[PDB]
Design a protein around this ligand. Sequence first.
Ligand SMILES: CC1=C(CCC(=O)O)c2cc3nc(cc4[nH]c(cc5[nH]c(cc1n2)c(C)c5CCC(=O)O)c(CCC(=O)O)c4C)C(CCC(=O)O)=C3C
Ligand SMILES: [Fe+2]
Length: 306
Amino acid sequence: KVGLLVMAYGTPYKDEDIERYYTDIRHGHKPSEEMIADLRGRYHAIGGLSPLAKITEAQAYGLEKALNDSQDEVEFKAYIGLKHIEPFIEDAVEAMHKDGIEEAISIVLAPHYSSFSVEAYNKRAKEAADKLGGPRINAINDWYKQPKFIQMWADRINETAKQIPADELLDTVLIVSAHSLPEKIKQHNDPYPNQLQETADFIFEKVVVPHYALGWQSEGKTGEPWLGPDVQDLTRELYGREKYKHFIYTPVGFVAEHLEVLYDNDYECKVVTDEVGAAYHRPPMPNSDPEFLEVLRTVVWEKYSN
Ligand SMILES: CC1=C(CCC(=O)O)c2cc3nc(cc4[nH]c(cc5[nH]c(cc1n2)c(C)c5CCC(=O)O)c(CCC(=O)O)c4C)C(CCC(=O)O)=C3C
Ligand SMILES: [Fe+2]
């Protein structure tokens, strides 16, 4: 019995939860009434709440099933550890410990590594284990190089492009993005930006879309520079220069439909394409598709074999 520590951001379960959730994201500093109002407005604009909770849950337990049905060397037990709402990363580790688990493999539901994302996940999990006395946490840092991951995204882009008139494929561009971070991470050799570039490069080689570009989205409310260009700004620039007629958005930094896709892409990017007169395309997120469960199953088993 090896625990499967599946970690993700988390999302408010109820509208009452919005305040403490934002407070946790802001490292305990309660946001103003104006910032809360904006956030609740965005959740309202996408229907009320994000489906991130149910998707994350199907992902974690679909992985556990996928691993357990494909071999009998080991039995896996999935525990969900969220970053900004319960159950927290530390609650999962405590749950693993009280359950007697001696060893566990941890994976973050985000394929790319960064000091701000995976590193924070791995740090909190290792600190909770050390304090508790177990289990031993064998962490996966990234997995965007998994061939099946690259292929799954190329298949989605290819399926969408096949519905674009050949008359217009030459005027179609693929926009590859992930959640922005403070630009300062580039001063210390953070791999995050280069991992995203590699991801876009690998996908581009396997799709019929002849143009592409790397953007970022969802940069925070601070006073510092963030990784750019923003996908909205990139969309305008690319239209001004090439007059592209089709924009295909794949935020490969995310693995599920949630606020940062349903609003930041399906609304704000759509607004831009509408403004310039181009078509908006955003292929389905991985969610809990068997193909994606197969991606995660391969990554975890590869990590176990090592
Ligand atoms: C690297 C990264 C990922 C990668 C994926 C992962 O790690 O899994 C990610 C994912 C997500 N981030 C999410 C939501 C939010 N992130 C915020 C704010 C921030 N994220 C940041 C970073 C990241 N975020 C940072 C550095 C801030 C600024 C904090 C500050 O201001 O000091 C805010 C606050 C308001 C705003 O900035 O808009 C919200 C609401 C949701 C789910 C939303 C839902 O569906 O409920 C998901 C999956
Ligand atoms: Fe975030």
